[PDB]
Nucleic acid binder design. Structure first.
Length: 19
RNA sequence: GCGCUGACAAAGCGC
């Protein structure tokens, strides 16, 4: 199951929204 | 395993 593969790219953006 | 929601979760739900 693709948890980490999706997460990696989504994470960068998710963080950068809050930032 | 790859998406897709979610906490950048776990879990779910497609392919």
């Amino acid at each position: 199951n693709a948890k980490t593969r999706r997460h990696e790219r989504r994470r960068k953006l998710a963080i950068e929204r809050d930032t």
